[PDB]
Amino acid sequence: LSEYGTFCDNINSILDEVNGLLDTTQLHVADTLMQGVTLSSNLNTNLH
Amino acid sequence: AQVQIDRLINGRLTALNAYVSQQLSDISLVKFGAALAMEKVNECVKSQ
């Protein structure tokens, strides 16, 4: 397998970049959900 | 020498197929990004 070792390096690198894209996408979705959100400190969902 | 060279041809042709597949996927992402940039030019720069 060491003669083909570049194939395993490319497979690992592509999966790592794909997972980095999923992490970056999840952060962007969370940022979109949190953008411009302002809450009262007095807000208690147990009563309200 | 034909047997040894055929092993190298298979490896190098597999390498090109893998690179070509990655390039097709990356250009699809670039086309999506370029459409977004054109939409941002039209809806944020030339108008609001």
Side-chain angles (χ1 to χ4, degrees):
Chain A
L1 183 61
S2 79
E3 317 294 0
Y4 294 80
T6 312
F7 274 108
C8 281
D9 294 344
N10 284 51
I11 281 156
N12 289 351
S13 299
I14 293 160
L15 285 182
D16 288 350
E17 103 187 353
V18 152
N19 293 332
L21 255 60
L22 284 175
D23 291 341
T24 300
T25 294
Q26 201 197 25
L27 273 164
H28 197 202
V29 170
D31 188 34
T32 298
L33 287 166
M34 279 293 119
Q35 190 59 45
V37 167
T38 298
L39 263 62
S40 177
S41 306
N42 302 13
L43 174 61
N44 188 352
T45 63
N46 295 307
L47 301 320
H48 297 109
Chain B
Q2 162 163 350
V3 176
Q4 305 303 316
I5 293 173
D6 208 326
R7 288 182 191 166
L8 293 185
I9 287 168
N10 271 104
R12 293 173 182 188
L13 292 184
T14 302
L16 289 176
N17 256 358
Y19 176 80
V20 156
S21 303
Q22 165 101 330
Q23 193 76 359
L24 269 165
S25 181
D26 293 347
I27 271 50
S28 82
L29 294 182
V30 172
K31 273 184 52 63
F32 166 95
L36 173 66
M38 287 167 23
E39 191 183 333
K40 289 217 188 192
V41 167
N42 287 323
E43 300 193 47
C44 313
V45 185
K46 293 183 182 293
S47 76
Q48 324 304 326

